[PDB]
Amino acid sequence: MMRDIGLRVQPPAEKCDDPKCPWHGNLKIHGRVFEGIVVSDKPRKTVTVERQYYFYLNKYERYELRRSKIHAHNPPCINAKVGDKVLIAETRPLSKTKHFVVVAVLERAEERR
């Protein structure tokens, strides 16, 4: 249920996660880590985080705005909300498009754009 996850981060306040969380079963935390922002909460235990990065163009010497959606599984111990940064773990597949699980949430009432 509630064990240290590492990365130098603390695990959620509550626990009761289903076996598709790295506190149960055989799906486990591993690897690299990101950060991004919740677009939507509409699917069940499922949450879209879309990241922003910049890329360079050598020809014009300038940057561009690109935006990569990444699908994130939210553990029922914590609820994601629109318009706040969320922290993502690199895990084996839940599904066709879900390869990520949400690990530690920093929540916020604020919204821009």
């Binding site: 590492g6 990365l7 130098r8 690897g31 690299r32």
Partner: protein
């Protein structure tokens, strides 16, 4: 190509062996054995190219069936034998010893030292794991596996210095790696340096786990615990003397 790659080309032959690159259209390909393929050196090469004892491979192979070379204090005859790194290789018909040491550059070179150092072979073991019958075992990435350490760790995680009595197949004089000990660097672009470890303080999250070291010169080297290899408290000679 949907089977196994069972040829290698010269142009496809890695330049960490210092092979000749355009000699022919095909290079000698290591079979599996003791240690990693783009970290090893073929027996063929040491014979034909390194030490000139052969003109044709019909030479070399005869040379390896009769016994001009033992690998690991043990006889061979496969003329596709990957000779390990930090390795003991012996000529018994002259009494020569070479270490398979990396140079500064990153090509594999043989460094000749006396017969006395040819009984010892420092192992730092690649992993350490429990087995059934309530034992653990000592690994290496030249493969060599040992049993026994009188229940539980009693020493260190894996960063070991072992004394292997190599003709005897035996493990002797275990010694940790500590914050005033020596290390030889076997992997990394800092290879061929032997130094005195400053500390073992680490940022372990994900794959990197950091270890620094400063040498006689004072060149700060950050290698993985694994790229780090415990030469000990100084016994065998440095590469490039």
């Amino acid at each position: 190509r949907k089977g196994p790659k069972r040829h290698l080309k010269r142009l496809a032959a890695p330049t960490s062996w210092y092979i000749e690159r355009k000699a022919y259209k095909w290079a000698v390909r290591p079979r599996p054995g003791p240690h990693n393929m783009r970290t090893s050196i073929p027996l063929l090469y040491i014979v034909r190219d390194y030490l000139g004892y052969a003109k044709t491979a019909r030479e070399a192979r005869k040379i390896l069936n009769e016994g001009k070379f033992l690998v690991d204090g043990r006889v061979r005859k496969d003329y596709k034998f990957p000779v390990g790194i930090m390795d003991v290789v012996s000529i018994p018909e002259t009494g020569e010893h070479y270490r398979v040491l990396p140079n500064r550059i990153g090509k594999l070179i043989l460094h000749p030292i006396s017969e006395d150092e040819a009984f010892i072979k420092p192992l730092r073991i690649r992993n350490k794991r429990m087995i059934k019958g309530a034992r653990v075992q000592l690994n290496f990435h030249d493969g060599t596996n040992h049993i026994v350490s009188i229940a539980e760790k009693d020493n260190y995680f894996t960063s070991y210095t072992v004394l292997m009595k190599v003709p005897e197949r035996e493990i002797l004089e275990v010694l940790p790696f500590e914050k005033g000990a020596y290390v030889f660097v076997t992997q990394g672009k800092n290879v061929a340096r032997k130094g005195r470890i400053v500390e073992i303080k680490r940022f372990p999250m994900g794959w990197p786990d950091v270890v620094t070291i400063e040498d006689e010169e004072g060149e700060l080297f950050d290698t993985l615990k694994e790229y780090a290899f415990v030469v000990g408290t100084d016994k065998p000679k440095i590469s490039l003397p």
